[PDB]
Write a protein that binds this ligand. Structure first.
Ligand code: FES
Lengths: 234, 401, 379, 55, 146, 49, 184, 171
RNA sequence: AUUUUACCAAUUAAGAAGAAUAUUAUAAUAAUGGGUGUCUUAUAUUUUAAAUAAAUAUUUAAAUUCCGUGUAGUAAAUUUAUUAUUUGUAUUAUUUAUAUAAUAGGUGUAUUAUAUUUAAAUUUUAAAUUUGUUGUUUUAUAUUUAGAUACAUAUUUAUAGAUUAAUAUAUUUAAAUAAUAUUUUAAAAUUUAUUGAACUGUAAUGUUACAGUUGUAUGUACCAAAUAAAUAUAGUAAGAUUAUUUUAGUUGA
RNA sequence: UUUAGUAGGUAAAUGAAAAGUAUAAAUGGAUAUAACUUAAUAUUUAAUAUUUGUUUAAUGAAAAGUAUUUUAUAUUGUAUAGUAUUAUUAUAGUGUAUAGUUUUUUAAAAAUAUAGUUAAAUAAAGUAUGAAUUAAUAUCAAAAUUUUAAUAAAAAUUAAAAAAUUAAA
């Protein structure tokens, strides 16, 4: 998991499978025994550890000397979701939907694909968001709600896409440890929504000139309309 | 004889009999044209061998086709230019939104948290600069946003500027149209305050040149006597920190001259006097600095800055007897003592082995070798080897020239 | 790879993503679960009646020697064979009766099929002989031309002495060792081979293939193959009505046009021939299984400017019925005229094959009533 | 000119001391009190003050 | 450093002692009609593939003022009026179909200005729309005596 | 002639410098190592142990 | 075209175009948000072998000392590195990074274009001299905790020469009141 | 793969050569070490050397492992009283050589004894240790340092209670 | 106060029409020497001859002969015909490019013998040549690529002797009538046709004349010269020769 | 080095794909393999040899070059050789004698080349550029002794061989 996609990484990469390669592997950098010429024993935890840790640092991971990126920062995670929604649904289509069910088949499929991509991105970013709840900011939480609205996914406060868990029999799902899989996605997202609502309330309580008066007014109006749209109060 | 491949790109030696070749002085390699062949391409217009066929279709498409525009389109584009007022309003709106949504720095304990990079603020900054004819320093903005108090004193000023512009007031545009007289308006004052905050952030960062430029733009915008005095004092301090003594002295003198137009409550006059005295001290004219400080005290007795500068000059005067006089007029400016001066020397200093008077000599706009330098006919100069072109002997020496 | 080589299992991980798809991936409930494609026999083409349905009264069960009728059922006007049937060696020894369809896809009557044609039990060796002949014959021999040392166009002179230079002794370097060089014995169209087929083997293999199709139930007898108009829309409509899947991935249809029962013809019907030119897989073949005795006038290199492969100079025409086409096209359609022509052209061969103690009886039973001698009205 | 060399045989030179002295040396310098430029002791400018008094 | 802008920087970086000879002249004559590199020829062909003989469309059903719908490309299903037609390129310009920015380099009298104009669209992409049916309909050239 | 080209290029990562960098040198060294180890196992390892 | 992504333990199909555009956008924005400026100079007029030595010399230094060493050196590689450092410093200034806290976080070169020149030889022999070029990568990051050595110190010889000349060994530091907008 | 640096420790280097008694390596273990006293009075020199080497190299322990260098220290005393069977004292040669052309030194056990008897005992111990381990410098050297030699009966290891080493000859 | 030991590491996903009126064979209907930037002038722009040749031939017999260098009208003007830029990218098949590059700041040791980490042990080229089997001989820097031809198999129509020198004799058991191929690189070669005297060597007074059964040591930096064509007994020179895990007889006659 | 267990068809040398042999069409390793003659590329030699542009006393043709003379200044045409180069080097026909008709780095030494017995000058490293022969080779072959089929760093025994730089056959 070192050299490939990690915790909050979006790219899906099966390190054992040599995808994204133009050459048939001739040399295996991580080799412990000469027998691995014909019996690599990949998949076994220890040998796989050796191979993956011998792999070089790709774009996702960072070297020990290169300066990493604070991907676990809420102020970065939220705008990532906003950009995902923006790319998924064009500004013209967003304006049309806001003004307005009479839509083209291509536009409907585009909206569905955007919702699916947003759900996948939320699934991938969930652990980082959960870790970054504590030191988030009111503007970024409001941005979280705005990004959900723009993606057109209604959060499960208790169309809708988070409320239904993905299909698949429990006896075949990938339960392997070390992979950030969230089987209880709707419950986790509902808990995150409640936590961010409480955090917004606490931030407003802590906060309690013309510029600041206008900021407070616009913030209150936003909070109100966004929570009403998502089906939340206070 | 033959040792490597037959192609010219092969490394090892060849012989004329086995692999006869044409005289190719210098040609690209398997990996594409190099810097030397490209220098030949740009200077001579083709590769030095001459067997290559020049092909700059892509360059033509990039430059001439792009810059070509018919007369009618060129004439109507100016008339169809966007609306300056609306564009400025939109630029201010988006800039304020970006600044407001800029995250606040986490005050970590035990070390200094890295300030988040300003990616989305550049484009709003660029458009705002284009609209207002001003240039904001990204380092200054970064420092202002990182500091909490400066962040508020910048946001409030920007919001006031937005409100006054939306209310229908564009003081610079109106003044320009009328010129094509009155005092400073609320919008212009807010803009000046915003620029002063940016300059303060620049000074805190250490970018004194950027601070001075921002304050100069603010001075250009301002027209009130009090605003002019304050901006001149700020520019004088910025130039002093930036090691621009002539500019600091000029701004201080201008502030001291505007003194009468300013009300007694303001301290811009005292600040200008202090800046002028500091510029004189850095120029190493202690008598002039003392006289200026005396005049400033006679004007505003009790000013804290004037008292501090007088005490410092008194300490310097007490140290002077060790020298028995002031710095001799011969040098009068030699010593350099500012970190700005050190940075300038590190950047533009003549390095050893390059960027010196022996490496290349810059003519009017062109680079020359030291031997062709027209500023000295030294022993390594081609000008030395000329003499007696045919007019007259021109020199008494009879060995060369 | 090779099963015994270590490379066959040198890869031990990464083949499968342990996370299954949420679309179609399922689990094995138990033996009661019916898995798609599962079958105890190694079926490289695991088709069923739904995929490629068979046109025959019965599914070809082992209990039945052939899916078609074994007796002339009274529900239909059964028709006998044009020529008398004698069971030669290799024939199924069983009565073959098949229903004849019309252009409306509904049976009109029943027809006897000659065992010597549709009753000769298939044999893999003969079928493979036919298939290999067809595969070798259907190559573009004109495209098998390669350069030669004498054709490389290089100076005919030693490029440098043996020892003077310091490189390997090479003179007139047109040889294969050099990238620009050629081969001493390259491949040429006139050096390639076109196999010579025997009429006996060709007929035997074609009749074996016809019997194989009959056994598999892919055979269908049609009264006529005429179209209202010579366009392609009419042909497609006829295919739709008759439930013929002529798509490139539908199974395909082979057509022995010939003619109707009352007017057999050796030439394809004009309208149907014009309308059968369709992109999808659908082949039209002549109503004959014999082949003109192949010959090779240039059996030796007597004509040096012969730009054709060594061997028979009279290869089987493409449109002729063959094992390759019979296997590629799922369903086979044969007209009454085609059956008449096949029986007419194979009757003499069958009689000649028959042994002497049956040959002598032939005239006694009336299988040699010659119209030329007035013994019977002309056939 | 008799046999090819391997990476370690090439790295022997960097192991040595002459290579380090010729390539891997750091110069000690300071900011000149007059011109405030980087300067190595013993070398000065052609400015009048530098010539008269040599920092 | 291979660009004309960085040529001066490259020359300054290069040492004085290394000399380049053929700065103004050349050994081989440069006024001989010779061929270009293979990649240059391929780029030329790609850039102007309409130079080939009989590149245009013979019937040429497409004329300005018609109504067409885009069947392939970026915009699919969007229909409009043919603003302009480029016959020798086999291209069409349809209002509000293929809109892209058209930058204009600054000059001594005006600054840079960004303008949007419908760009040419390949003829094969669009299909004619019959006004009466208001759907996609095949078209064919016909001759009539007025 | 068959050599363990594909089988030994896999473990070619276990050598140093020229052998690990250049396919031919690494393959030759690995072939020699495998043969010598086989000989040692079949004629001296048991005796030593 | 769909792309398979592992979600909730099962593979899920997502729009491949959106997936790719999102991945590239995230990579680019993450790299931009990283508090460092990276510069690439192509076709450097110096053989990569020689340039690597100067790169190793300059590696792991603050921007100030890197510039000082490059200016005080007499090597083509050091001059090229000085030019690269100047360009990277300008880029960092434009990007907003603090100049006084700049440091080199990566300096490396790899082979680039290569021109060839004919060198005549006696006895009719000849070869092709190789004109090598390099690609230089220079990354300037920020290290707020970085503390720089005090290079303002000067030799006692310089101190006493200045004293003889009458100058002051210490700098003439004058307190500079911070700019204020009270008068506005 | 393992890489032994070409920059080794040389006898001419100021850093000098180590003493494996004070070294700390994965293959050095002095925790299980014991101390024996070997009185070589009237005992044949080759036999004494072999007996001492058996304990010095650690071959006398059931946990012996060729890779691991663990052995008991042996204090050899009364080396002056060591005996040689017959005329061997003057008829047994010791041969060494320098890189110079002349180079060769042929000397007698009598001369080696007159210079330093402990040197002769060290020579025989070295011969045994080389006989058993010769392919590795560490193995060739460490047991020799484990060995202790004293020509007289006075040794400073009384603070270790070296138990007397009792053995029997093949006869 | 001061300071982070020496040594040791690795190649991969490719940014954009920097690859097609493309490469080879294939058309049996054209044809007075194709030459654009060409553009009067025709004493000065003439190539013809009964022969194996840009016209190219369906079998094994007999037969001259010191290795038999070998087979006829098949139809008589009868369709085996030297074709050919598009009224299908002509058709069918076939073949195809190395422009382009951050990769990691330390798993093994630190007084010397060589991958698999418990320390050790083992270890120090391959191919051909050498039949007195070597220590003789030759080749190999490395990466990728190019590179060599003996048909492993015969289903009903179907039918197959011998024999004398010769005449002649013929008491007396078979059979799946099929042919076309035959490593590869390299001989001091020789043969045909042609050019060179600007170098060099003569005669004439820099130039002219004389040239490969040959002009005067040499005839344009290998004189058994140079250029063009060719695959000679390549054999009784030599070298190379592409497919591991195998499944049966003799080791100096 | 007189045997079992386990692997495991059998007692040793004539490749393997059910995927274009396509109905097959989004996650098919169809991994199916020439160490020396071909072609291209990357290295070693290479921190290398070489190169290094501060000083000038003097031809008026032609074959020979064709290097864009913006207008160079009857008809027609003016400058910029050859030795594969901007090289050892004046191409000399005619013809003349004061036009200064103007590009050769560097702070020592070896070696090499020039330079009051008898029969002392010039060519450095370093900055910069950057070849060529060569190259089976593991991080390598101190040394001695002994021996094996021709030099035998091939073998064994014995012994103790540091790294870099320059020079020396
Ligand atoms: S001012 Fe620094 S050298 Fe003179």
């Amino acid at each position: 998991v070192y050299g490939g996609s990690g915790r909050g990484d979006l790219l899906y990469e099966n390190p054992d499978a040599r995808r994204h390669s133009g050459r048939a592997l001739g040399v295996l950098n991580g080799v412990r025994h000469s027998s691995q010429a014909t019996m690599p024993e990949s998949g076994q935890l220890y040998y796989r550890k050796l191979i993956l840790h011998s792999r070089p640092p790709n774009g996702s991971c960072a070297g020990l000397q290169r300066h990493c990126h604070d991907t676990c920062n809420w102020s970065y995670l939220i705008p990532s979701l906003h950009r995902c929604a923006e790319s998924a649904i064009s500004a013209k289509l967003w304006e049309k939907m806001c003004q307005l069910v009479n839509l083209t088949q291509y536009e409907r499929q585009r909206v569905r694909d955007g919702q699916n991509l947003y759900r996948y991105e939320v699934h991938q970013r969930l652990p980082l968001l959960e870790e970054s709840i504590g030191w988030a900011q009111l503007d970024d939480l409001l941005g979280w709600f705005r990004s959900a609205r723009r993606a057109w996914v209604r959060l499960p406060t208790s169309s809708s896409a988070m409320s239904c868990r993905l299909e698949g029999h429990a006896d075949s799902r990938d339960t392997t440890p070390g992979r950030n899989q969230v089987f209880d996605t709707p419950e986790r997202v509902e808990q995150l929504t409640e936590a961010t609502v409480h955090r917004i309330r606490e931030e407003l309580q802590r906060l309690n000139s013309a510029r600041r008066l206008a900021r407070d007014e616009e913030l209150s109006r936003c909070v109100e309309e966004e929570l009403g749209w998502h089906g939340v109060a206070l | 004889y033959q040792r490597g491949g037959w192609s010219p790109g092969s490394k090892h030696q060849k012989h004329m009999t086995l692999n006869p070749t044409l005289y190719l002085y210098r040609f690209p390699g398997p990996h594409g044209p190099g810097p030397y062949t490209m220098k030949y391409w740009w200077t001579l217009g083709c590769f030095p061998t001459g067997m290559e066929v020049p092909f700059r279709l892509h360059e033509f498409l990039s430059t001439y086709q792009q810059e070509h525009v018919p007369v009618e389109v060129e004439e109507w584009l100016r008339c169809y230019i966007k609306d300056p007022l609306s564009e400025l309003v939109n630029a201010s709106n988006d800039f304020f939104k970006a600044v407001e949504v800029y995250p606040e720095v986490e005050s970590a304990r035990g070390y200094k948290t890295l300030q988040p990079s300003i990616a989305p603020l550049l484009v709003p900054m660029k458009k705002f600069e284009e609209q207002l004819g001003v240039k904001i320093s990204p380092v200054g903005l970064r420092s202002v946003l990182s500091n909490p108090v400066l962040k508020d004193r910048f946001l409030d000023d920007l919001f006031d500027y937005k409100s006054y512009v939306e209310k229908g007031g564009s003081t610079p545009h109106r003044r320009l149209a009328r010129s094509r007289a009155e005092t400073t308006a609320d919008d212009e004052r807010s803009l000046i305050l915003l620029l002063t905050t940016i300059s303060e952030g620049c000074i805190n960062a250490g970018n004194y040149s950027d601070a001075a430029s921002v304050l100069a733009d603010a001075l250009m915008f301002c027209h009130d006597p009090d605003s002019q005095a304050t901006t001149h004092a700020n520019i004088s301090f910025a130039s002093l920190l930036n090691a621009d003594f002539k500019g600091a002295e000029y701004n201080g003198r201008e502030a001291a001259l505007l003194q009468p137009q300013v009300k007694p409550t303001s301290t811009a006059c005292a600040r200008g006097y202090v800046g002028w005295a500091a510029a004189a001290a850095y120029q190493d004219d202690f008598e002039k600095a003392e006289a200026i400080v005396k005049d400033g005290l006679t004007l505003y007795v009790g000013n804290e800055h004037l008292e501090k500068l007088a005490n410092k000059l008194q300490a310097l005067r007490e140290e002077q007897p060790s020298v028995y006089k002031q710095v001799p007029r011969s040098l009068r400016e030699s010593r350099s003592h500012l970190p700005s001066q050190q940075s300038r020397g590190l950047l533009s200093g003549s390095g050893k082995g390059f960027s010196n008077e022996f490496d290349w000599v810059e003519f009017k706009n062109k680079l020359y070798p030291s031997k062709m330098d027209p500023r000295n006919n030294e022993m390594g100069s081609v000008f030395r080897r000329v003499g007696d072109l045919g007019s007259f002997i021109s020199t008494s020496r009879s060995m060369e020239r | 790879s090779s099963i015994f080589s270590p490379r066959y299992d040198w890869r031990t991980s990464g083949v499968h993503d342990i996370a299954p798809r949420d679309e179609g991936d399922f689990l094995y409930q138990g033996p009661q679960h019916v898995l798609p494609g599962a079958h105890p026999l190694p079926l490289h083409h695991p088709h069923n009646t739904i995929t490629r349905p068979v046109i025959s009264p019965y599914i070809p069960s082992p209990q039945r020697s052939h899916p078609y009728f074994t007796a002339p059922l009274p529900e239909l006007p059964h028709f006998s064979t044009t020529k008398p049937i004698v069971y030669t060696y290799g024939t199924m020894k069983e009565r073959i009766i098949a229903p004849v369809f019309n252009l409306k896809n509904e049976v009109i009557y029943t027809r006897e099929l000659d065992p010597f044609i549709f009753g000769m039990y298939p044999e893999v060796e003969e079928l493979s002989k036919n298939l290999t002949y067809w595969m070798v014959r259907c190559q573009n021999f004109a495209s098998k031309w390669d350069y030669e040392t004498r054709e490389i166009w290089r100076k005919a002179k030693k490029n440098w002495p043996n020892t003077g230079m310091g490189m390997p002794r090479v003179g007139n370097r047109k040889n294969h060792l050099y990238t620009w060089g050629g081969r001493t014995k390259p491949s040429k169209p006139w050096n390639m081979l076109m196999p010579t087929m025997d009429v006996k083997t060709w007929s035997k293999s074609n009749r074996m293939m016809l019997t194989l199709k009959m056994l598999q139930g892919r055979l269908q007898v049609v009264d006529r193959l005429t179209l209202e108009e010579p366009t392609q829309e009419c042909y497609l409509e006829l295919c739709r009505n008759m439930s013929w899947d002529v798509r490139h991935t539908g199974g395909g249809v082979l057509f022995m046009d010939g003619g109707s029962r009352i007017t057999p013809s050796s030439e394809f019907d004009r309208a149907f021939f014009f309308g059968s030119f369709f992109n999808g897989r659908n082949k039209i073949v002549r109503p004959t299984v014999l082949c003109d005795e192949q010959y090779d006038y240039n059996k030796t290199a007597a004509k040096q400017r012969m730009k054709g492969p060594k061997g028979a100079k009279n290869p089987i025409p493409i449109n002729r019925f063959n094992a390759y086409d019979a296997m590629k096209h799922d369903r086979l359609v044969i007209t009454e005229g085609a059956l008449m022509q096949l029986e007419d052209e194979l009757y003499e061969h069958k009689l000649q094959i028959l042994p002497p103690h049956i040959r002598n009886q032939l005239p006694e039973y009336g299988y040699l009533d010659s119209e030329a001698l007035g013994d019977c009205v002309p056939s | 000119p008799k046999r090819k060399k391997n990476p370690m045989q090439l790295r022997r030179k960097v192991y040595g001391l002459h290579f380090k002295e010729k390539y891997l040396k750091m110069e000690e310098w300071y900011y000149c009190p007059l011109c405030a430029e980087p300067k190595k002791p013993g070398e000065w400018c052609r400015r009048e003050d530098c010539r008269q008094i040599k920092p | 450093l291979r660009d004309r802008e960085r040529l001066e920087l490259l020359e300054s970086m290069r040492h004085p002692r290394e000399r380049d000879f053929y700065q103004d002249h050349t050994y081989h004559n440069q006024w001989l009609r010779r061929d270009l590199e293979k990649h240059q020829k391929q780029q030329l062909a790609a850039r102007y593939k309409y130079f080939a003989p009989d590149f245009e469309i013979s019937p040429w059903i497409w004329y300005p003022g018609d109504i067409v719908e885009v069947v392939s490309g970026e915009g699919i299903g969007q229909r409009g009026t043919i603003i302009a037609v480029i016959k020798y390129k086999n291209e069409i310009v349809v209002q509000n179909i293929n809109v892209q920015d058209v930058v204009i380099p600054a000059s001594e009298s005006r600054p840079e200005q960004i303008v949007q104009r419908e760009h040419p669209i390949s003829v094969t992409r669009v299909r004619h729309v019959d006004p009466s049916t208001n759907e996609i309909c095949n078209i064919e050239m016909v001759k009539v005596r007025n | 002639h068959y050599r363990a080209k594909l089988e030994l290029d896999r473990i070619r990562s276990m050598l140093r410098g020229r052998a690990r960098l250049e396919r031919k040198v690494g393959l030759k060294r690995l072939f020699f190592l495998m043969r010598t180890q086989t000989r040692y196992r079949v004629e001296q390892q048991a005796h030593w142990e | 075209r769909y792309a398979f992504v592992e979600e909730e333990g099962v593979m899920h199909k997502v729009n491949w175009g959106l997936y790719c555009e999102r991945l590239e956008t995230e990579l680019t924005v993450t790299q931009e948000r990283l508090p460092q400026h990276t510069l690439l100079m192509k076709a450097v007029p110096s053989s990569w072998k020689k340039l690597d030595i100067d790169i190793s010399v300059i590696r792991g230094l603050s921007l100030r000392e890197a510039m000082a060493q490059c200016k005080l050196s007499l090597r083509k590689g050091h001059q090229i590195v000085f030019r690269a450092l100047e360009m990277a410093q300008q880029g960092a200034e434009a990007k907003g990074l603090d100049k006084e806290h700049l440091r080199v976080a990566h300096i490396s070169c790899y082979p680039g274009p290569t021109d060839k020149q004919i060198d005549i030889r006696s006895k009719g022999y000849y070869a092709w001299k190789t004109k090598k070029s390099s690609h230089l990568v220079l990354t300037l990051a920020e290290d707020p905790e970085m503390v720089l050595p005090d290079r303002t110190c000067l030799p006692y010889s310089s101190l006493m020469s200045m004293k003889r000349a009458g100058l002051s060994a210490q700098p003439t530091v004058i307190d500079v009141p911070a700019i204020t907008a009270d008068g506005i | 793969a393992p890489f032994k640096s070409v920059l080794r420790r040389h006898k001419h280097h100021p850093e000098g050569l180590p003493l494996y008694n004070d070294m700390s390596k994965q293959w050095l273990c002095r925790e299980g070490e014991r101390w024996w006293l070997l009185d070589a009075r009237g005992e044949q020199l080759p036999r004494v050397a072999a007996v001492a080497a058996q304990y010095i190299t650690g071959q006398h322990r059931p946990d012996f492992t060729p890779g691991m260098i663990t052995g008991d220290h042996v204090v050899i005393v009364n080396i002056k009283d060591v005996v040689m069977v017959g005329d061997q004292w003057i008829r047994v040669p010791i041969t060494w050589q320098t890189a110079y052309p002349g180079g060769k030194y042929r000397i007698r056990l009598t001369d080696m004894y007159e210079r330093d008897p402990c040197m002769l005992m060290w020579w025989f111990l070295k011969d045994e240790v080389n006989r058993h381990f010769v392919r590795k410098l560490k193995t060739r050297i460490a047991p020799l340092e484990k060995a202790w030699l004293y020509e007289d009966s006075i040794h400073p290891h009384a603070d270790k209670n070296p138990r007397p080493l009792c053995w029997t000859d093949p006869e």
